[PDB]
Write a protein that binds this ligand. Structure first.
Ligand SMILES: NC[C@@H]1O[C@H](O[C@H]2[C@@H](O)[C@H](O[C@@H]3[C@@H](O)[C@H](N)C[C@H](N)[C@H]3O[C@H]3O[C@H](CO)[C@@H](O)[C@H](O)[C@H]3N)O[C@@H]2CO)[C@H](N)[C@@H](O)[C@@H]1O
Ligand SMILES: [Mg+2]
Ligand SMILES: [Mg+2]
Ligand SMILES: [Mg+2]
Ligand SMILES: [Mg+2]
Ligand SMILES: [Mg+2]
Ligand SMILES: [Mg+2]
Ligand SMILES: [Mg+2]
Ligand SMILES: [Mg+2]
Lengths: 59, 125, 80, 135, 50, 121, 52
RNA sequence: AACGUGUCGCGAUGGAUGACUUGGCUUCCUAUUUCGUUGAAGAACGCAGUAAAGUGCGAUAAGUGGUAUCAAUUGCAGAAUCAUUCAAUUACCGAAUCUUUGAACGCAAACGGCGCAUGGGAGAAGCUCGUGUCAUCCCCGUGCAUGCCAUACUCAGUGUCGA
RNA sequence: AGAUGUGGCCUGGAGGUUAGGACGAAGCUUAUGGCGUGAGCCUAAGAUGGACCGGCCUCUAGUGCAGAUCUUGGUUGGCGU
RNA sequence: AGACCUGAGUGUGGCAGGACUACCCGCCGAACUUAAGCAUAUUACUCAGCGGAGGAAAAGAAAACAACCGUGAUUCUCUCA
């Protein structure tokens, strides 16, 4: 789950989740919040562990 | 801490300046995760010195692009295809106004009467 | 009746927000703003209300460019 | 003539201001022709016009305009004054020859004393209550 | 209801992020003027009508 | 600075709405007469870490080192000039630099360039 | 009306009258001035003070 | 008696008066003093370690550059050096940045919408001898409102000729 | 009703003069008396205040309240109804 | 075939559009009011409305005034009045 910029589509969020983070997004479900921000749920490709990515990010 | 001085930053090339811009956009992006997951007040708090040094790399990159493009259109007779972002921005009214190579244009007779009868300096006693 | 009961019969919106005016003055059936006359190129300005003239005037907002161009003229368009 | 555009010919108030059809505009049609050109072709500075032809319905005027951004006009001394931005719409302010006609500036002496430089320039001058300082 | 334009949703989102109180350290500055927020909007008392 | 003029309302506005480079000159202190007589300068803008002695107030006759020039509060902070709160914790008490003369200067080669500029010789 | 205009002779005859009364030492003294040690009224000094 | 009434002393309620005044109002003066398609004024949304409003600024976002100043800012944190520049801070200004709009101008519009040319990008399918290349899809730049002036090619006309 | 006179009183500021104030100015308070026909002035006491101000001669004006279904703020009987 | 004339289409280089509008230029243009009524007249060739510039604008270089012993572009001031 990431806050992304509110003027990106789901295709360019997948391509940024490949160049920053060396993982493969199979499904992005975006959501412009009542805060005003766009939140994306980004499911990884089951060849990539979610905790192993989230430790490298650190959270 | 890490803080790009601009005097050692203007001596870089266009490739090394971009390579240290991705270096510092990446370091800012992994402090936006410690700004959301708690964060010690020392690691966080390098957010201004990074974000103002990104502003120094981009102002060296952009001042080197307008310098190498203003010296691409004033070089020769290509100054009709000069894009208007590079032209001398004045007031809108001052660009349309008559230049002073113009506007002192005068008739062959108006030149003669200022040469046959010029305004004299004189006194009185 | 015309008092309390008829207040509940008011359902829609006459005006929505103006894309230019800023205000809740854009008429929906007649596509025109009650306050800045948008989409007309000129804005509403009437000397029978100078108090409204003094509210939509230069300097009531931010003046992003008249800040910079007034000192460009005051410093006589200097250039190194 | 000028039909007064009151709704349905109905107008109000004092009977001197009741007429609709016999009223006449205070600008001649040559000035009105020059203003319709220059309000329509904004990049051109019109200087004066002249009578061409009449019909029973229409009058025609050739209005001479000049392009102020043309490099010929800017470099030519006897026409480059038109490029200065005080002549931007000479027609809309009564500064052409037909404008100076309906202002009365064909006359100079005792026939124009109420209207030199303008009627408003003489109205203001003749009616402003002057307060001298020590009086 | 469900339909809103996104430009109305983003104006309604600004007013949620403005509806927060003055923090306490504002009240401890030198030339202080602000005790409370004077613009605390409540959804029932005053209507935005976007 | 030239704050004083004919109009009080304008003079008293340019004092209390002064930038911190104007507030530095306005927050000046005299020099001690063994130090005024050396540099031939009569007063000096106060820096941090230069030593002063206090001449007006309840803290008059107190020496010490300047630890903060708090220009927003128009005051100075000497370490040796302080008191305690209800907790027993100590807090530094502000003095205006009028009430204070300098007994040692903190010198840099931008501060040694102000003394050569104000040198009356 | 802020400013007033006074006749030219009546401004001159008022400057003269206030100038005549400076010679009277009773009127200079009854106006506040401490002239108790002054040599003479009208006091007149030399022009060496115009070079101090 | 009780209630009540009156007078003084002390309390409360109330927020006048005085003193104060970084504000208004009025007058007078000095200029290489007058915005915008090179996108203005206005409107919108954002930007701080902490930040609602306001101020300042624009994804370089409470600012970057340069000059002058010469050790702060300070509510609390943080911070190479503790100061001939190359990192205080403030003031000033030449170099820049300047989101979405708006005359608003590719077409629309209670749509963060959709084009036609053109260039760049990314590209886990294919093809290639993991590299390259890369179909749709998806991003980004630029050109394109209309009128007019000048201009250098393609035309229309049983307009007048002409072979 | 009205006119007029007043070395008649009072308030803000200005020109002059003469003086007060941290040993306590302005303001406020009154079973504080004094004296003026009166408008008013002055003293005293504050177990009040905390920094400005008086008198006289001239000059000037946004200069004197009890009521305008007066304006604005507050309070009150009705009423613990 | 070609020309000339009158019109098109694109390419290229430009410009106009909105803001301000105190003053100023062009138009448009009232009524309350005053006349102790009211209609001419007055308010006023003013308010409001529309268009257009500038640092000022507008005017200006005699188809002028005069009737003199003559004057000499415009603008403004005092006066004329
Ligand atoms: N005394 C009544 C007041 O008089 C004031 O005005 C007075 C004077 O200011 C005013 O004087 C005017 C003068 O101002 C103006 N500049 C010129 C005029 N010549 C003067 O008038 C003068 O001459 C006339 C006759 O010519 C006399 O009738 C008049 O009394 C005299 N003052 O005439 C009034 C006579 O005293 C105000 N109008 C006003 O405050 C009030 O009516
Ligand atoms: Mg005249
Ligand atoms: Mg559009
Ligand atoms: Mg009064
Ligand atoms: Mg316009
Ligand atoms: Mg009236
Ligand atoms: Mg009447
Ligand atoms: Mg008007
Ligand atoms: Mg002119």
């Amino acid at each position: 789950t990431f806050i992304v910029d509110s003027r990106a589509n789901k295709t360019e969020i997948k391509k940024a989740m490949r160049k920053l983070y060396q993982v493969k997004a199979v499904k992005v479900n975006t959501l412009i919040r009542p805060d005003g921000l766009k939140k994306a749920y980004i499911r990884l490709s089951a060849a990539h562990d979610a905790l192993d990515t989230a430790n490298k990010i650190g959270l | 801490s890490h803080h790009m001085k601009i005097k050692d930053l203007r001596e870089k090339s266009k490739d090394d300046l971009l390579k240290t811009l991705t270096e510092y956009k990446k370091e800012l992006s992994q402090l936006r995760v410690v700004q959301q997951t708690g964060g010690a007040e020392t690691r966080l708090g390098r957010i201004r010195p990074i974000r103002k040094s990104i502003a120094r790399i981009l102002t060296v990159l952009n001042q080197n692009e307008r310098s190498n493009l203003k010296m691409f259109y004033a070089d020769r007779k290509l100054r009709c295809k000069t894009p208007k972002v590079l032209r001398a921005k004045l007031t809108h009214r001052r660009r349309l106004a008559l230049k002073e190579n113009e506007k002192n244009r005068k008739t062959s007779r108006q030149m003669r009467q200022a040469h046959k009868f010029p305004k004299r300096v004189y006194a009185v006693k | 009746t015309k008092g309390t009961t008829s207040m509940g019969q008011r359902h829609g919106r006459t005006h929505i927000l103006c894309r230019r005016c800023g205000r809740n003055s854009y008429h929906v059936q007649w596509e025109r703003c009650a306050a800045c006359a948008y989409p007309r190129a000129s804005r509403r300005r009437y000397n029978w209300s100078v108090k409204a003239i003094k509210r939509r005037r230069t300097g009531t907002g931010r003046c992003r460019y008249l800040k910079v161009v007034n000192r460009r003229i005051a410093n006589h368009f200097k250039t190194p | 003539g000028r039909k007064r555009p009151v709704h349905k010919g109905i107008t109000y108030g004092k009977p001197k201001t009741s007429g609709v059809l016999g009223m006449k505009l205070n600008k001649n049609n040559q000035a009105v022709a020059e203003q319709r050109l220059g309000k329509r072709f904004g990049n051109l500075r019109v200087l004066n016009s002249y009578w061409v032809n009449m019909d029973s319905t229409f009058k025609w005027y050739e209005v001479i305009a000049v392009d102020p951004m043309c490099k010929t006009i800017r470099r030519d001394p006897r026409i480059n004054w038109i490029v200065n931005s005080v002549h931007k719409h000479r027609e809309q302010r009564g500064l052409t020859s037909a404008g100076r006609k309906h202002r009365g500036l064909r006359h100079k002496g005792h026939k124009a004393s109420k209207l030199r430089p303008s009627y408003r320039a003489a109205w203001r001058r003749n009616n402003r209550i002057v307060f001298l300082r020590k009086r | 209801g469900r339909f809103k334009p996104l430009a109305v949703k983003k104006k309604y989102a600004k007013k949620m992020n403005q509806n927060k109180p003055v923090p306490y350290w504002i009240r401890l500055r030198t030339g202080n003027r602000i005790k409370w927020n004077e613009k605390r909007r409540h959804w029932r008392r005053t209507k935005l009508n976007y | 600075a030239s704050i004083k003029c004919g109009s009080r309302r304008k003079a008293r506005r340019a004092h209390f709405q002064a930038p911190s480079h104007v507030r530095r000159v306005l927050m000046s202190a005299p020099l001690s007469k063994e130090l005024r007589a050396k540099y031939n300068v009569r007063a000096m803008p106060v820096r941090k870490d230069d030593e002063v002695i206090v001449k007006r107030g309840t803290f008059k006759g107190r020496e010490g080192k300047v630890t903060a020039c708090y220009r927003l509060k128009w005051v100075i902070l000497i370490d040796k000039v302080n008191r305690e709160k209800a907790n027993g914790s100590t807090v530094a008490v502000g003095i205006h630099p009028s009430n204070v003369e300098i007994t040692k200067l903190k010198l840099t080669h931008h501060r040694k360039s102000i003394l050569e500029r104000k040198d009356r010789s | 009306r802020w400013h007033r205009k006074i006749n030219l002779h009546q401004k001159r005859f008022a400057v003269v009258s206030a100038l005549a009364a400076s010679s009277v030492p009773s009127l200079v003294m009854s106006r506040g001035h401490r002239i108790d040690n002054v040599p003479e009224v009208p006091l007149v000094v030399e022009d060496s003070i115009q070079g101090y």
